Amino acid sequence: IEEQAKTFLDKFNHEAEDLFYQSSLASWNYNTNITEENVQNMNNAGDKWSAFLKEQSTLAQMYPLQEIQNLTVKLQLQALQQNGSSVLSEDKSKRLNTILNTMSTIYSTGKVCNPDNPQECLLLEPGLNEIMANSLDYNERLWAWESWRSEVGKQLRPLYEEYVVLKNEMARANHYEDYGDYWRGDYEVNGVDGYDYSRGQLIEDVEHTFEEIKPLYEHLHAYVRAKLMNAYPSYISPIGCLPAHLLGDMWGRFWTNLYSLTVPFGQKPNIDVTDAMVDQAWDAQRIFKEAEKFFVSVGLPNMTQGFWENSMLTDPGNVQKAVCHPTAWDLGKGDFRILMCTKVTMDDFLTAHHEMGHIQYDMAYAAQPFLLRNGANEGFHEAVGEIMSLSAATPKHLKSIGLLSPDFQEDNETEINFLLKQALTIVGTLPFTYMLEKWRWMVFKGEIPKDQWMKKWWEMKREIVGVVEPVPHDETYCDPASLFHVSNDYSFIRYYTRTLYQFQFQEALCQAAKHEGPLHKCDISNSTEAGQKLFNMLRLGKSEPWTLALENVVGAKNMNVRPLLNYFEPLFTWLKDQNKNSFVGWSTDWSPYAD
Amino acid sequence: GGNYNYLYRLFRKSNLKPFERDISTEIYQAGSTPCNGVEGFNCYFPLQSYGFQPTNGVGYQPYRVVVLSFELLHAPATVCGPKKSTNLVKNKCVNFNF
Ligand SMILES: *[C@@H]1O[C@H](CO)[C@@H](O[C@@H]2O[C@H](CO)[C@@H](O)[C@H](O)[C@H]2NC(C)=O)[C@H](O)[C@H]1NC(C)=O
Ligand SMILES: *[C@@H]1O[C@H](CO)[C@@H](O[C@@H]2O[C@H](CO)[C@@H](O)[C@H](O)[C@H]2NC(C)=O)[C@H](O)[C@H]1NC(C)=O
Ligand SMILES: *[C@@H]1O[C@H](CO)[C@@H](O[C@@H]2O[C@H](CO)[C@@H](O)[C@H](O)[C@H]2NC(C)=O)[C@H](O)[C@H]1NC(C)=O
Ligand SMILES: *[C@@H]1O[C@H](CO)[C@@H](O[C@@H]2O[C@H](CO)[C@@H](O)[C@H](O)[C@H]2NC(C)=O)[C@H](O)[C@H]1NC(C)=O
Ligand SMILES: *[C@@H]1O[C@H](CO)[C@@H](O[C@@H]2O[C@H](CO)[C@@H](O)[C@H](O)[C@H]2NC(C)=O)[C@H](O)[C@H]1NC(C)=O
Ligand SMILES: *[C@@H]1O[C@H](CO)[C@@H](O)[C@H](O)[C@H]1NC(C)=O
C-alpha cells in the first residue's frame, strides 16, 4: 500500500544520516593525517555503512513500486530498490571481485624499463608521464607509447573479456539488454507529461550534436597539422592523420600540452599574474577571501564560518603524510569542507573557484531529502563549478580587483592567444569523449565479436578523431583498456555533456547580465539577476527531473550546442584565414609505417 | 563521538492537543499486520535519537530552548515583572505614587 512506504522512508532518512556522518568523517581524518590505525579506523566505519545499506536494500522489494502516486517518494524508492549485484551466484559474485581489483592493480603496477637498461624501471606517473608531456623526441615517444599498452593492456584483455560477460547477465536480470543500458539509467525520466526522457534517445542527441561542431574540430585539426610539420618534419603527411604518440599525453585526451609549439603570437606576453601577488604579499587567506567576495557580488550567500577552521587550505608545515588533491567534502549536517595545498599562483587562483563552486552547489540543496542530494544528473556537478573559473579568466575582472594596471589595453593579439588556450582544452576532448563511449556500448550490447573488438576500435579512431596508429595492432593489446576510467569501471559519458551544459548556463546569464561584447568578455560579477536565475536551479538537486531543471535557466529541454559555437566566433573569424592554403580533411588510409 | 543522550518522537497515530504530553513508549505499528510486541515491517519503536557532534553546521547543533506562556485563570494576587521606583523628594509640591 502507499501509506506503508511513506512512513518507512521516515525511518530510513534518520538512521542513515548519523551512520553516513561518521563514515565520511573517518575518510576525512585519514586523508588529512595518514597513519596505519586510521586505515583500519575507516575500514570498519565504512563497513558499517555498506552492511547497513544492503540491510535495507532488500526491504524495498517488499513494496510494489507502481502503486505509488507521489513522484517525490516514488523517486526515493526506485533508487533504493536497486540491487546492483546480489542477484547472481555467490561463487560467481566473488568471481567478479576476483576480476575487479585484479583489473585495478594491473593498471597501477604498470612498470616500464628500457631495452638498453632494464634496471631503471619507471612507473606511469613518474617519468613516463613527463616523457609525453615535455620531451619532444619522436623515437622516444613511440617507444613509451607502444610499451605501455602492450605491457598493461595486453594483460587485462583476458581480464576484461570475461568481465563484459558477467556484467551483462546481472544487468539483464534487472530487465535491461546490456550494461550500456544501465549507464543511461541516470538520464532516464519516465511519466511526467512532457518532461519525459527515455534511455535510447541520448544516442540520438549525441549523434546530432557532435556532427554540428565537426567543422570546428576539422579546423583545429587542420590548423595544428599546419603547425606540426615544424616541430615534427618528415613524420606526418599533411593530408593524412596524426600519429598517436605525440598528442600531448599517452592517449591525447587533453591537448593543453600543445599550446607552446602552437601559440599564435609567441612574443605576446600572456597574463600570468603571479609576480603581482607576491609584490602585495598574497597569502592563502587572501585568495579565498576574493573567491568568496566574488560570490557575494553575484547574489549568493557567504561561507558558513565553519568552513574556514574545519578546512585545510595549505599543506601543513609539519612533515605530514596526507594526500594532496583539491576536493570538496560534503559530510553533512551543515559541515562542508575543502582540502588542497595552495601555492600562490594565478593557476591555483583559478582552481580556488572551481572547488568553491562545488561547496555553494552543495550548500544549495541542503534542504532536500537524503537520497536526492546530488546534482540533477552526473554531468551537472562538474558543470556548475567550471563556469565559475571562466569568469576569472577575464582581464576586466582582474583589473577591477586591483591586480592589473588600469592602463591595461586588451589588444586582439592576446585574444587570439587566450581563446586558443581554451580551444585546446574544450574542443580538444569532445571527439575523444564520444569516440570511446561509442565504442564501449557496441562492445557492451555485443555488436562486435571479441575477435574484432580491437579491429573495430582502431577504425573509429581514424575517421572521427583523425589519429593514425604508430604500430599495427593484432588482437592482443586491449588498447582501449589502458585508460584510467576505462580500467577502473567508470561512466565516461559524464565528461562530454558536462561541456555542453556549461555554456548554456554561461551565455544565458551573460544575456541576463546585459553583455554586449563577445562571449569571452562577459562578466557575471556585480550582477544580481544573473545570480537569481541560477539560484532557482541550484536549490532543486534531484527533487525535479533535470529536463525541467535545465529550462529553469536557459529555456530548453535538451543540450544545445549553439551556445558553445557562440564562444569561438572571434577565434573562428581568425582561424578561417589560416586554412586558405592548408587542407581541412584527413585521409584515413595513410599510416606512418605503410611506406 | 556523538552525544546520543537526547531523543525525539517521530511517530504517532494522531497529532497532539495543545500542551499535550506523551511520555509513553508504546511500540508503533504502521501496517495492517500485528507484531506480538516485537519490531518488524511497518512496525517501529516510536523514539529516535539526536546525533550530535561539535563539528556540525548551524541548524544541526543543539539549541537550549525555553518556552514561556502566561496564564490568568482566576487567581487573586500572582507574580509579574519588576516595578522600578524613582528617588523620593521632600518639601516640594510633587506628583507621587506609593
Ligand atoms: C594522526 O592521528 C593519530 C591517531 O588518529 C594521532 O595519534 C594519537 O592521537 C591521539 C588522539 O586521541 C593523541 O591523543 C595522541 O597523542 C596521538 N599520538 C601521538 C604520538 O601524538 C597522531 O598524533 C596524528 N598525527 C599528528 C601529526 O598529530
Ligand atoms: C506529496 O506531494 C505533495 C506535493 O505534491 C507534498 O506536499 C507538501 O508537503 C509539505 C510538508 O509535507 C508542505 O509543507 C507543502 O506545503 C506541501 N505542498 C503541497 C503542494 O501540498 C507532500 O509532502 C508529498 N508527500 C511526501 C510524503 O513527501
Ligand atoms: C532484486 O533481486 C531479486 C532477486 O533475488 C528480484 O526478484 C525478487 O525475488 C524474490 C525471490 O527471489 C521474490 O520474492 C520477489 O518478489 C522478487 N521481486 C519482485 C519485485 O517481484 C528483485 O526484483 C530485484 N529488485 C530489483 C529492483 O531489481
Ligand atoms: C586587431 O584589430 C586590428 C584593427 O582592426 C586589425 O588590423 C587590421 O587588420 C586588417 C586585416 O588584414 C587589415 O586589412 C588592416 O589594415 C589592419 N589595420 C591596422 C590598423 O593594422 C588586426 O588584424 C586585428 N588582429 C587580429 C589578430 O585579429
Ligand atoms: C563592481 O564591484 C566593485 C567592487 O565593489 C566596484 O568597485 C569599486 O570601484 C570604485 C571605482 O573604481 C572604487 O572607488 C571602489 O572602492 C570599488 N569598490 C570596492 C569595494 O573597492 C565596482 O563599482 C562595481 N561595478 C559597478 C559598475 O558598480
Ligand atoms: C558576509 O560576511 C560579511 C562580513 O564582512 C558581512 O558584512 C555580510 O553581511 C555577510 N553577507 C551576508 C549576505 O549577510
H, E, C per residue of B5-49: CCEECCCCCCCCCCCCCCCCCCCEECCCCCCCCCCECCEECCCEE
Closest-lying ligand to the alpha carbon of A37?
1
How is residue A101 written as a grid cell?
581489483
With 0-12 CB in 10 A as exposed, 13-18 as middle and 19+ as buried, what is A519?
buried
The response to whether residue A83 sits with its C-beta less than 6 Å from ligand 3 reads yes
Residue A355 bears catalytic tag: yes
Nearest to A18 among B51, B55, B59 (CB): B51
Exposure string of A76-109, with b = 16+ CB inside 10 Å and e = fewer, is bbeebeeeeeeeeeeeeeeebeebeeebeebbee
Number of A/B CB contacts below 8 angstroms equals: 48
Do the strands B7-8 and B48-49 form a parallel or antiparallel pair, or are they unpaired? antiparallel
Nearest-angstrom CA–CA distance, A499 and A495: 7
Nearest-angstrom CA–CA distance, A167 and A181: 11
What are the Cα distances from residue A428, in Å, to A180, A211, A272, A434, A484? Answer: 25, 15, 23, 12, 18
Nearest to B56 among A3, A11, A333 (CB): A333
User: How big is the CA angle at A68 (ends A62 and A73), to the nearest 5 degrees?
Assistant: 90
Resolution for the entry shown, Å: 4.0
Compute, in angstroms, the gap from residue A287 CA to the centroid of ligand 6. 17
Please tell me which residue of chain B has the smallest CA distance to A336.
B57
Element (H, E) at A328: strand A327-332
Nearest-angstrom CA–CA distance, A557 and A336: 32
Of A164, A134, A132, nearest to A148 by C-alpha is A132
Nearest-angstrom CA–CA distance, A438 and A436: 5
Cite the DSSP H helix spans in A299-394: 307-310, 347-362, 380-390
Do the strands A467-468 and B7-8 form a parallel or antiparallel pair, or are they unpaired? unpaired
Nearest-angstrom CA–CA distance, A73 and A6: 7
> CB count, 10 Å around CB of A119?
6
Give the phi and the psi of residue A318 in degrees, each rounded to 5. -65, 155
Q: Is B57 on the interface with A (CB under 8 A)?
A: yes
Do the strands B43-44 and B28-29 form a parallel or antiparallel pair, or are they unpaired? antiparallel
Which is it for the CA torsion A313, A377, A514, A522, positive or negative? positive
Distance in angstroms between the alpha carbons of the first and the last residue of chain A: 73
> CB count, 10 Å around CB of A4?
15
Of A379, A329, A333, nearest to A358 by C-alpha is A329
The response to whether residue A416 sits with its C-beta less than 6 Å from ligand 4 reads yes
Q: Nearest-CA distance from B41 to chain A in Å?
A: 9
Nearest-angstrom CA–CA distance, A433 and A54: 34
Which amino acid appears at position A492 of this protein? F
Which amino acid appears at position A364 of this protein? A
Show residues of chain A in contact with B57, CB under 8 Å.
304, 306, 333-336
3-state DSSP helix/strand/coil percent for chain B, to nearest 5? 0, 10, 90
How is residue A344 written as a grid cell?
600562490
Contact A18 B48 (CB under 8 A): no
| Residue-wise DSSP of A372-391 | G-S-SSTTHHHHHHHHHHHG
Q: Where do we find the cell 542477484?
A: A87
Residue A473 bears catalytic tag: no
Of A470, A443, A471, A445, nearest to A457 by C-alpha is A443
Contact B56 A62 (CB under 8 A): no
Non-local (6+) Cβ contacts of B91 within 8 A are none
> CB count, 10 Å around CB of A484?
12
Whether A578 and A223 have beta carbons less than 8 Å apart is answered as yes
Contact A21 B59 (CB under 8 A): no
- A138-172 vs A90-108: helix crossing angle, rounded to 10: 170
Phi-psi sector, A148: left (phi>0), alpha (psi -120 to 50), beta: alpha
The response to whether residue A32 sits with its C-beta less than 6 Å from ligand 1 reads no
Do the strands A467-468 and B28-29 form a parallel or antiparallel pair, or are they unpaired? unpaired
Would you say how long chain B is, in residues? 98
Do the strands A467-468 and A242-243 form a parallel or antiparallel pair, or are they unpaired? parallel
Ligand 5 site, CB within 6 A: A 297, 400, 526
